[PDB]
Amino acid sequence: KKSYTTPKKNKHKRKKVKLAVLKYYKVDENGKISRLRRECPSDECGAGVFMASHFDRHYCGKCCLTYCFNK
Amino acid sequence: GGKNRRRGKNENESEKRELVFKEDGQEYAQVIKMLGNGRLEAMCFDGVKRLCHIRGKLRKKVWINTSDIILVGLRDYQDNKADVILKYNADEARSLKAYGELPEHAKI
RNA sequence: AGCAGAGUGGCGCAGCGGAAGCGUGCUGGGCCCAUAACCCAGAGGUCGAUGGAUCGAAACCAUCCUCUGCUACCA
RNA sequence: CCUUUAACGAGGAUCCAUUGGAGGGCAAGUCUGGUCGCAGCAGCCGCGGUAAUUCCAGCUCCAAUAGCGUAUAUUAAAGUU
RNA sequence: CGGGAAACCAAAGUCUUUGGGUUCCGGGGGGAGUAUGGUUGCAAAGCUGAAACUUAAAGGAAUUGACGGAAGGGCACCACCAGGAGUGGAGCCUGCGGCUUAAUUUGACCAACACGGGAAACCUCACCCGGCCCGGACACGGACAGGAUUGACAGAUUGAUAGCUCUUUCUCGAUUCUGUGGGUGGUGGUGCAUGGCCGUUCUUAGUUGGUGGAGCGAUUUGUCUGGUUAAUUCCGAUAACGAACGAGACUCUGGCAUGCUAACUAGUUACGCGACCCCCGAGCGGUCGGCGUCCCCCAACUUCUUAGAGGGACAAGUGGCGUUCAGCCACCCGAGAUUGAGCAAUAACAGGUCUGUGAUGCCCUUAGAUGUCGGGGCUGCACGCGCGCUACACUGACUGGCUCAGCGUGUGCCUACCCUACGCCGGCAGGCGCGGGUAACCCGUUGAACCCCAUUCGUGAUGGGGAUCGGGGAUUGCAAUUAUUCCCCAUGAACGAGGAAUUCCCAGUAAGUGCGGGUCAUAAGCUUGCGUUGAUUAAGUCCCUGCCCUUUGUACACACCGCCCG
RNA sequence: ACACCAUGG
Ligand SMILES: [Mg+2]
Ligand SMILES: [Mg+2]
Ligand SMILES: [Mg+2]
Ligand SMILES: [Mg+2]
Ligand SMILES: [Mg+2]
Ligand SMILES: [Mg+2]
Ligand SMILES: [Mg+2]
Ligand SMILES: [Mg+2]
Ligand SMILES: [Mg+2]
Ligand SMILES: [Mg+2]
Ligand SMILES: [Mg+2]
Ligand SMILES: [Mg+2]
Ligand SMILES: [Mg+2]
Ligand SMILES: [Mg+2]
Ligand SMILES: [Mg+2]
Ligand SMILES: [Mg+2]
Ligand SMILES: [Mg+2]
Ligand SMILES: [Mg+2]
Ligand SMILES: [Mg+2]
Ligand SMILES: [Mg+2]
Ligand SMILES: [Mg+2]
Ligand SMILES: [Mg+2]
Ligand SMILES: [Mg+2]
Ligand SMILES: [Mg+2]
Ligand SMILES: [Mg+2]
Ligand SMILES: [Mg+2]
Ligand SMILES: [Mg+2]
Ligand SMILES: [Mg+2]
Ligand SMILES: [Mg+2]
Ligand SMILES: [Mg+2]
Ligand SMILES: [Mg+2]
Ligand SMILES: [Mg+2]
Ligand SMILES: [Mg+2]
Ligand SMILES: [Mg+2]
Ligand SMILES: [Mg+2]
Ligand SMILES: [Mg+2]
Ligand SMILES: [Mg+2]
Ligand SMILES: [Mg+2]
Ligand SMILES: [Mg+2]
Ligand SMILES: [Mg+2]
Ligand SMILES: [Mg+2]
Ligand SMILES: [Mg+2]
Ligand SMILES: [Mg+2]
Ligand SMILES: [Mg+2]
Ligand SMILES: [Mg+2]
Ligand SMILES: [Mg+2]
Ligand SMILES: [Mg+2]
Ligand SMILES: [Mg+2]
Ligand SMILES: [Mg+2]
Ligand SMILES: [Mg+2]
Ligand SMILES: [Mg+2]
Ligand SMILES: [Mg+2]
Ligand SMILES: [Mg+2]
Ligand SMILES: [Mg+2]
Ligand SMILES: [Mg+2]
Ligand SMILES: [Mg+2]
Ligand SMILES: [Mg+2]
Ligand SMILES: [Mg+2]
Ligand SMILES: [Mg+2]
Ligand SMILES: [Mg+2]
Ligand SMILES: [Mg+2]
Ligand SMILES: [Mg+2]
């Protein structure tokens, strides 16, 4: 039960990198949508959530412990 | 030394101790010899002997025997007089010797 | 240089051939609420060195060395 | 100078009362911060060693008041000449 | 009489109602009867005799305690005597000091030291070394629905599969985040700020007020000369009378009932029996008998077991000793003439506990935490000490055989585990398989050990003793290395009764001996209870250590561990 | 008919 001494590195947490909100769709024409990244074929997922464009990887943020495609 | 004195603040000993160094107008000293009336002859670790007085706080609570390291606070107006502020144990005295605090003329 | 005395436990010593202890000091216990006094146990020995006698010695004999007192005091 | 008199001359913020004290003797606070047997207080007894009614200050209160405190000489208290 | 602060005083009286005459002499405590001057003396010394300085008390009488190497009366195996077993010596276990260490967390010094249920592998856990987290209410303000904010795959990184951080960018949705106040938690500090609890003074007989009496008062009597008692228990005496607490009474427990109540979750006897077995008896072997925890009874009963109600012992009877009182000794009868514990006063201690607590004041820390995971420690070893276990053998060790207990506990809610029968397998620890028990129902008729009866050893550190160490096999667990515990072969240390000292004990007691509960996933050399075998010595005293009551002394009151002189 | 028995954070 004695006081703490000056550290060497201490730093708390990352800063939640501030990406733009939503640019996952592009139009060829109004009412003719295109999708850059594929929607994940998952049952628990409602088929409306997207995947990371992580070339050499495909990562679904919902299933945070499985379902990653390696190409 | 044993006695019926269970009264009084019973036990003021621990295996932990923390150092205290010099300040403004405050030197170390070595007890030269014992006198009466609570007085004392000392010797500042550089110069004068500077006969000392054991202050009201130390009386019969922390004993001072001859030839030990002490920390005394000098008087500004007078010179030959001072008041014993703190006592340094053997391990802490050797520690000060290691940190180069006391000119190594007196040993433990 | 000589005479006399002594050489044994850290120190003072005892020990008239069948052979290592005393007093003090040192360290730890006891006693006491505690300290001294007092009680107990422990540790520490080329018995000055070298030969000889003796069935066998620390002791007796011979040589040498080292301390102490007293005279000698000595190109 | 006083007195007699014109003309000016008050709203309380200034035309702003101080000197000592608040444990007891001895009238008046166990209110709040700071120091921690130090600094200091205290005529006397006594306060201060980390939860100070006595120290340093703020607020409040007590005493006498244009006065009040201190050192000394002396008188009463002293039926202690 | 009266006086006085009182002790005391017919004088120390006739004193604020103060005046019979007269000589000497004092003015807080020291410095000091000192320095100096004078005078006397042979000398030693006598007489007269200051001051500077210093200090808040010195002192008197009486009271209440504590103390006494003071006296009187009593008392206790935490006292002795007479003894027993010992402890101190040896090896090991465990606690405390010291040393060492990153840390070896810490409290406590008769009334600490096998104590904190403290037998710590993780946890516990407070210590040391690293790493995540918020589980920071609430108020206000700030940013914020192209949006506050959450969580995470892969490579690097890390003890780590902690999105901890870094590269990359999906996902969640107002629950957050930033800042200022304010809370919160703490096995953080202070037990000398406290509550409560406990320990101890203190196991003895001690304590207190109301009205009355004595004193100016603190105080005192009641609460006692004497006898008696384990006892301030009684008898009595009596300026006291009438009361309260503690003691006693009280509760549990051990000893006795052939009397009562009544029992297949307890038994006995009887025979209904039936059956096995042996002649072991007359006899034939059958009938009669003998053994049976072999099987039955809608047999009869409660002796043994259970547990309820009552009974029973009161110094009641008899003899002595007692002021013929309170009571004491002995004896008959008897299950017994003196079982053992629980509870316990006024006043107090700077006793222990903030580490039992959602008991608690104040101080400290509060996100780089003093609020969680991984690893190490609490166990380290020149040494000093305490409580204990096993031994030093023949009143023994070993190997077989025989034969007897009692107090208990037992399936768990969160928490996941209980006690075991019997069959098989294995030398052993242990494994597999099937049943009973929430219990007078099953383990269990609890086949306990010492003891008893026979073998081998033979005075030799021996076949006594079992430390230390090598190699192997099991079980609990997430994990056994610094060996958790258990089993097997081997190695085979000190120790031949213990110096000065010192502890506990009076009858089913000391000591020997094993068994349960507590802690317990694993596990007792500890403690708390139970039985079993079962002595020697006493019926006393105040010597030693202390305690209680009276008288006495005191320069003590922080109370003899006091005070105090040079 | 009487050995020794000092001191106190
Ligand atoms: Mg004039
Ligand atoms: Mg003022
Ligand atoms: Mg003032
Ligand atoms: Mg003030
Ligand atoms: Mg005043
Ligand atoms: Mg007043
Ligand atoms: Mg303050
Ligand atoms: Mg204050
Ligand atoms: Mg005057
Ligand atoms: Mg007269
Ligand atoms: Mg007259
Ligand atoms: Mg005077
Ligand atoms: Mg005179
Ligand atoms: Mg003269
Ligand atoms: Mg004073
Ligand atoms: Mg007196
Ligand atoms: Mg008295
Ligand atoms: Mg007496
Ligand atoms: Mg007796
Ligand atoms: Mg005896
Ligand atoms: Mg023994
Ligand atoms: Mg063990
Ligand atoms: Mg330790
Ligand atoms: Mg006692
Ligand atoms: Mg263990
Ligand atoms: Mg641990
Ligand atoms: Mg708090
Ligand atoms: Mg707490
Ligand atoms: Mg206390
Ligand atoms: Mg207390
Ligand atoms: Mg009265
Ligand atoms: Mg009266
Ligand atoms: Mg009385
Ligand atoms: Mg009696
Ligand atoms: Mg009576
Ligand atoms: Mg009465
Ligand atoms: Mg009679
Ligand atoms: Mg009879
Ligand atoms: Mg009884
Ligand atoms: Mg009591
Ligand atoms: Mg407590
Ligand atoms: Mg607290
Ligand atoms: Mg604890
Ligand atoms: Mg936790
Ligand atoms: Mg841990
Ligand atoms: Mg420990
Ligand atoms: Mg003990
Ligand atoms: Mg035995
Ligand atoms: Mg047991
Ligand atoms: Mg068990
Ligand atoms: Mg057990
Ligand atoms: Mg224990
Ligand atoms: Mg004793
Ligand atoms: Mg008595
Ligand atoms: Mg008296
Ligand atoms: Mg006094
Ligand atoms: Mg004394
Ligand atoms: Mg002196
Ligand atoms: Mg003494
Ligand atoms: Mg002395
Ligand atoms: Mg002295
Ligand atoms: Mg003293």
Swiss-Prot record, chain A:
The modification N6-acetyllysine is found at residues 23, 32, 71. There is a cross-link at residues 26, 32 (Glycyl lysine isopeptide (Lys-Gly) (interchain with G-Cter in ubiquitin)). Coiled coil: none annotated. Signal peptide: none annotated. It comes from the Eukaryota. It is found in: Cytoplasm; Nucleus, Nucleolus. A zinc finger (C4-type) spans 40-63. Part of the 40S ribosomal subunit. Part of the small subunit (SSU) processome, composed of more than 70 proteins and the RNA chaperone small nucleolar RNA (snoRNA) U3. Component of the 40S subunit of the ribosome. Part of the small subunit (SSU) processome, first precursor of the small eukaryotic ribosomal subunit. During the assembly of the SSU processome in the nucleolus, many ribosome biogenesis factors, an RNA chaperone and ribosomal proteins associate with the nascent pre-rRNA and work in concert to generate RNA folding, modifications, rearrangements and cleavage as well as targeted degradation of pre-ribosomal RNA by the RNA exosome. This is Small ribosomal subunit protein eS31. It comes from Oryctolagus cuniculus. The lineage of its organism: Eukaryota, Metazoa, Chordata, Craniata, Vertebrata. The gene is RPS27A.
